[PDB]
Amino acid sequence: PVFAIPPKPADYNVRTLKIDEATWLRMIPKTMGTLFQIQVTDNTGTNWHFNLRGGTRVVNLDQIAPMRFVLDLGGKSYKETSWDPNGKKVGFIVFQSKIPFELWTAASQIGQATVVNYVQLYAEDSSFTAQSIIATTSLAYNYEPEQLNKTDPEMNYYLLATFIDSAAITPTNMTQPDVWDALLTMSPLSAGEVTVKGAVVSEVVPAELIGSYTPESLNASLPNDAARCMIDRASKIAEAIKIDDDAGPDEYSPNSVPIQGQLAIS
Amino acid sequence: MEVCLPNGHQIVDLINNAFEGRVSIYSAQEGWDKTISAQPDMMVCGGAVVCMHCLGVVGSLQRKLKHLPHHRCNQQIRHQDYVDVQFADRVTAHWKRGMLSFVCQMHAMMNDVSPEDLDRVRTEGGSLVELNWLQVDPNSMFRSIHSSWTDPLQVVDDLDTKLDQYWTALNLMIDSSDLVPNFMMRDPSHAFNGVRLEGDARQTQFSRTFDSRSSLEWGVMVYDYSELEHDPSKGRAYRKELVTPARDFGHFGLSHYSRATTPILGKMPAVFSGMLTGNCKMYPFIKGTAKLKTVRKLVDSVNHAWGVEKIRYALGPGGMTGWYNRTMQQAPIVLTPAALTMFSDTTKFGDLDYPVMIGDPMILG
Amino acid sequence: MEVCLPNGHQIVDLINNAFEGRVSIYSAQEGWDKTISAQPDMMVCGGAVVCMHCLGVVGSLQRKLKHLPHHRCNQQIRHQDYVDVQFADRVTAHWKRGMLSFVCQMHAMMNDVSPEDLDRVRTEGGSLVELNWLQVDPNSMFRSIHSSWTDPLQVVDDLDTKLDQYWTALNLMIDSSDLVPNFMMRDPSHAFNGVRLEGDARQTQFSRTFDSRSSLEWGVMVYDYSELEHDPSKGRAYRKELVTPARDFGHFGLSHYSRATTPILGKMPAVFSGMLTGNCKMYPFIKGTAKLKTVRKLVDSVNHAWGVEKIRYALGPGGMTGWYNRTMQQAPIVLTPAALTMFSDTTKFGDLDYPVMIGDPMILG
Ligand SMILES: [Zn+2]
Numbered sequence: 001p002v003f004a005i006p007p008k009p010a011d012y013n014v015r016t017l018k019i020d021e022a023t024w025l026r027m028i029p030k031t032m033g034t035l036f037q038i039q040v041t042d043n044t045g046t047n048w049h050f051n052l053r054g055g056t057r058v059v060n061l062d063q064i065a066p067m068r069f070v071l072d073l074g075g076k077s078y079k080e081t082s083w084d085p086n087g088k089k090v091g092f093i094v095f096q097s098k099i100p101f102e103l104w105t106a107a108s109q110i111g112q113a114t115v116v117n118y119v120q121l122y123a124e125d126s127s128f129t130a131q132s133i134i135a136t137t138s139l140a141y142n143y144e145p146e147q148l149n150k151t152d153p154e155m156n157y158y159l160l161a162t163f164i165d166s167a168a169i170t171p172t173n174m175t176q177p178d179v180w181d182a183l184l185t186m187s188p189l190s191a192g193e194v195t196v197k198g199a200v201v202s203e204v205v206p207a208e209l210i211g212s213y214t215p216e217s218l219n220a221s222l223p224n225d226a227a228r229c230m231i232d233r234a235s236k237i238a239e240a241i242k243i244d245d246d247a248g249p250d251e252y253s254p255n256s257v258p259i260q261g262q263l264a265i266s
Numbered sequence: 267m268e269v270c271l272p273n274g275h276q277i278v279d280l281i282n283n284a285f286e287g288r289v290s291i292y293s294a295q296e297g298w299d300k301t302i303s304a305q306p307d308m309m310v311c312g313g314a315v316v317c318m319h320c321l322g323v324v325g326s327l328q329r330k331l332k333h334l335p336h337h338r339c340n341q342q343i344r345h346q347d348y349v350d351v352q353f354a355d356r357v358t359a360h361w362k363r364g365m366l367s368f369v370c371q372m373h374a375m376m377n378d379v380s381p382e383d384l385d386r387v388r389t390e391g392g393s394l395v396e397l398n399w400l401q402v403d404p405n406s407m408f409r410s411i412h413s414s415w416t417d418p419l420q421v422v423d424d425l426d427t428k429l430d431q432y433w434t435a436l437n438l439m440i441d442s443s444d445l446v447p448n449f450m451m452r453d454p455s456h457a458f459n460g461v462r463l464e465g466d467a468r469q470t471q472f473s474r475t476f477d478s479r480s481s482l483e484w485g486v487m488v489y490d491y492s493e494l495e496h497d498p499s500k501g502r503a504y505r506k507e508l509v510t511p512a513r514d515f516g517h518f519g520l521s522h523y524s525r526a527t528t529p530i531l532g533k534m535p536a537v538f539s540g541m542l543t544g545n546c547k548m549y550p551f552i553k554g555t556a557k558l559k560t561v562r563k564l565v566d567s568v569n570h571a572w573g574v575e576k577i578r579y580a581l582g583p584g585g586m587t588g589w590y591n592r593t594m595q596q597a598p599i600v601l602t603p604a605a606l607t608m609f610s611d612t613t614k615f616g617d618l619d620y621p622v623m624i625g626d627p628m629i630l631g
Numbered sequence: 632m633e634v635c636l637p638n639g640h641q642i643v644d645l646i647n648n649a650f651e652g653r654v655s656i657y658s659a660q661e662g663w664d665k666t667i668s669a670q671p672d673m674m675v676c677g678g679a680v681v682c683m684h685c686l687g688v689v690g691s692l693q694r695k696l697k698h699l700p701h702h703r704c705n706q707q708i709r710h711q712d713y714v715d716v717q718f719a720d721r722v723t724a725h726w727k728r729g730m731l732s733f734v735c736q737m738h739a740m741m742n743d744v745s746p747e748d749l750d751r752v753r754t755e756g757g758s759l760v761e762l763n764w765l766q767v768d769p770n771s772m773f774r775s776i777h778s779s780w781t782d783p784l785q786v787v788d789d790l791d792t793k794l795d796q797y798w799t800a801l802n803l804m805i806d807s808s809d810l811v812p813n814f815m816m817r818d819p820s821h822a823f824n825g826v827r828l829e830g831d832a833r834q835t836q837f838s839r840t841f842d843s844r845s846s847l848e849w850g851v852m853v854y855d856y857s858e859l860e861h862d863p864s865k866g867r868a869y870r871k872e873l874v875t876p877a878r879d880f881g882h883f884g885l886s887h888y889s890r891a892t893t894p895i896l897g898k899m900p901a902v903f904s905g906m907l908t909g910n911c912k913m914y915p916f917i918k919g920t921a922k923l924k925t926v927r928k929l930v931d932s933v934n935h936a937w938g939v940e941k942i943r944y945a946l947g948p949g950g951m952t953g954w955y956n957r958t959m960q961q962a963p964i965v966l967t968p969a970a971l972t973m974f975s976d977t978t979k980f981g982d983l984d985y986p987v988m989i990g991d992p993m994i995l996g
């Protein structure tokens with residue numbers, strides 16, 4: 001709480017993230033012929049159909065702190081030989097299971113699931129011939145840890161984004177693993193919690209943050225990552241030094257020598 | 267707990283759902299299950315959970331609701347002010363279930379034709395399957411003075427999955443054997459203005475929608491291909507080349523094109539999305555401008571009950587009246603399922619040669 | 632000059648390279664050239680230059696390094712703590728060079744068959760080329776008790792380019808003449824658990840990896856298609872239709888599909904990426920979960936030597952132990968070259984008909 005400051009949103013394309021970089025993503029391994037149709041209802045009792053298969057990715061909700069998700073499928077295609085996104089529906093499904101997502105292969109392992117939100121897509125023709133372009137969407141979901149109320153330590157909380165339909169989705173028609181190849185915007189729903197590389201921490205050691213992030217890791221960090229915060233606090237220092245320093249290339253100054261001192265002894 | 271009005275696009279969504287019979291309704295009596303009619307307390311409008319007593323947003327699909335949330339409700343939205351939507355939704359729901367029972371019926375029969383009978387028709391032609399229209403959903407609000415729209419919805423698990431499955435099975439069969447159905451149209455608009463009628467079917471009065479202002483109880487209308495059989499120059503060979511559905515719609519398993527039925531129930535043709543579009547969804551052939559009118563009474567109701575700025579800030583430019591107008595001009599786009607504008611441009615046989623009459627649905631060669 | 636630990640993905644990268652024998656190692660003795668073994672001083676892990684004495688990042692690929700940078704080194708990372716990686720990398724390096732000499736050998740021979748001999752086999756079948764396995768990389772750690780993994784790496788300029796070129800040439804020839812090799816597998820996993828063994832080959836013990844815990848010295852294993860030739864109903868015509876590689880993998884020049892060899896060296900089949908994937912890269916058929924274990928000792932080593940927060944902030948959630956666990960679950964994805972999961976699903980002939988034995992590699996009709 002003391003370290004944090006008002007955060008800013010971040011954009012990602014869950015499909016193009018590297019799972020060995022974004023520690024908050026899980027994925028069903030391809031090449032295993034994994035494929036199974038399931039059914040889940042939304043909070044109004046309405047039943048929905050969708051498939052999970054090799055490639056399907058989910059967000060591991062546990063440990064990311066209060067967070068708002070907004071998905072924009074605008075510009076994407078998803079047009080296949082026997083599937084037209086136009087008029088179809090996509091939704092956010094939140095699973096609660098004791099079984100790790102990577103191990104899923106049958107509908108029986110998904111534990112408790114609920115379609116928490118959905119929108120109907122509108123497609124048209126894009127500048128790219130033979131391709132359909134989906135209209136802009138703003139599918140939202142607010143992850144409020146207190147609402148889920150995790151009790152059983154072996155419980156996993158997952159977030160998925162796929163096509164859902166009132167009619168069973170024929171696996172050979174719509175083959176995409178999910179609709180995560182889209183623009184996802186995350187916005188922290190709290191400014192009192194901080195994470196470090198994907199997971200919440202009750203406290204930070206500012207100095208240990210120094211030089212510990214690769215470009216890949218920074219880019220994959222959550223909007224409430226300590227690094228991001230460190231950077232916004234630090235930039236006020238940079239701004240300050242520039243108001244006072246008019247040093248040209250390679251010229252010393254009262255604000256550069258402090259480093260020189262460390263280097264001299266080092 | 268102050269509440270706000272929903273945004274324009276959410277009301278457009280309510281309407282679109284209503285005409286698919288899938289509006290999520292909540293009543294204190296039955297909860298979220300609308301199998302049994304009751305006055306709506308809440309309805310889901312494009313994600314938002316709206317109170318049907320003030321038309322204010324009291325929640326969303328994200329948090330589950332077991333009751334109508336406690337809110338500062340102006341309580342000026344009367345049932346009569348939105349029943350047109352409720353009517354539309356319930357009647358479409360009754361309609362889909364009715365259409366399904368009809369499809370299954372044709373399916374089962376077609377799926378019983380002995381290989382001999384089939385092969386004979388393949389070679390010479392002639393009747394192969396016939397359903398007594400008096401048996402097509404006999405106790406629906408569409409076929410009996412005793413039934414009403416407020417009646418319970420026939421519980422059907424996986425309505426849309428079955429509709430997809432059976433319609434597909436049926437059409438694949440009809441296509442493989444170059445058969446001819448008398449219950450299909452190349453352009454449903456011809457039903458209301460084109461095809462020539464015979465028998466009692468001549469007095470038919472198409473409201474072209476689902477509203478409580480014109481009887482929806484009527485007979486099952488189909489084509490009377492009788493004079494076609496009689497014609498010498500229009501024997502089997504002719505049918506295989508022009509009459510079978512494949513010639514005007516394309517081969518079922520290889521087309522995006524939608525297929526429509528003749529007015530089987532509620533004087534309303536049904537449109538099925540092409541197979542290669544993902545699945546086979548069924549939609550009533552009602553114009554967007556017609557669908558929008560279901561909220562005409564609601565507009566005045568809202569204008570009377572809500573503050574000027576509140577309406578302006580939620581519904582946009584021109585308030586809710588402006589929204590209604592702007593939407594009316596967009597109806598062809600924002601209130602029209604894609605399947606309705608996906609018919610083959612090229613049509614050899616067409617819908618104008620033989621007459622339509624109240625009769626038995628059937629498949630022949 | 633304080634240093635930090637590398638990030639998770641950089642260690643995953645180290646491992647992936649090791650199993651391609653391409654980890655960039657620097658020793659004070661030999662510099663960046665690892666032709667001659669020496670204890671590692673630095674290794675490149677996904678762009679970062681890591682000190683092998685504390686596992687701290689002391690540089691990157693951007694600035695050139697001629698020595699190990701002066702830094703505050705905890706010096707608690709022992710050679711034994713990362714030798715499993717060094718072993719993996721060096722052995723794979725020895726393995727690739729060995730596999731190359733084998734490919735060239737088949738190539739040259741195949742590229743010498745007189746047009747007469749070729750044409751005869753094209754017509755009746757029978758042997759066309761045979762290599763005495765005793766001549767397949769005779770002095771490698773894989774074929775001689777005298778050789779070790781620490782031995783010098785046979786200097787081979789353009790190893791990967793040659794591997795691509797020759798494997799291609801060889802397979803194009805084998806394909807154009809519908810020939811049959813006895814050194815290929817449709818699914819290398821059958822080598823460890825499937826194909827039936829004969830002769831001494833029966834006692835073979837597959838570690839299924841490259842580690843210093845199971846002898847890697849063994850014979851050259853191939854298929855014994857002898858009984859196939861004998862079979863009357865399985866003459867040339869039969870082979871052209873089911874046995875030639877094209878039938879199960881696809882025509883070499885027109886496929887994405889990978890082709891694998893039988894255990895020729897180090898009891899480890901080799902997988903070649905399809906031609907239409909860009910080039911023909913060779914990879915050992917080792918599971919990702921197996922590859923990860925090479926850093927198991929390093930995890931404990933790091934946990935013992937580094938500060939809690941330093942490990943947490945660099946390796947992520949769960950520190951380095953957590954990283955190891957999370958990576959183990961992802962092994963099939965993050966530690967598996969694409970080529971290993973790119974085999975044709977459809978397989979007519981397969982790998983289970985004839986037995987595998989320690990014998991001569993050969994191409995026949
Ligand atoms: Zn209210």
Ligand SMILES: [Zn+2]
Nearest residue numbers: 682684685704
């Ligand atoms: Zn060091």
